[PDB]
């Protein structure tokens, strides 16, 4: 469901469409509470949107690269590029609104 993506395949797989990037780590508690929300999520938008996860921790880089300081945080791509950023805990009903934005 969720896809997995590192500092080496980034640039590969967030790169035509539209992405929400999860980024995430294990001693995060709300992100935790997010995960079920996005496996969910993912199943709403099966060939409209994909749905990846990013480690902070083993991947420090495009997390600076994107300016993430705190987590849970959220960011939607589209085409390669940042448009959008969603910050702590958020429902299904909010995340969707803002992949429908973008879609």
Known sequence: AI???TDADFDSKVESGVQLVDFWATW???CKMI???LE???AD???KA???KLDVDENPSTAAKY???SIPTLIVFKDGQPVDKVVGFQPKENLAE???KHL
């Open 67 to 69: 300016e993430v300081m």
């Open 50 to 52: 994909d749905i990846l």
């Open 45 to 47: 938008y099966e060939g």
């Open 28 to 30: 995060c508690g709300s």
């Open 40 to 42: 969910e999520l993912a």
């Open 98 to 100: 803002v992949l429908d």
């Open 3 to 5: 896809v997995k993506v």
């Open 35 to 37: 995960a079920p929300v």
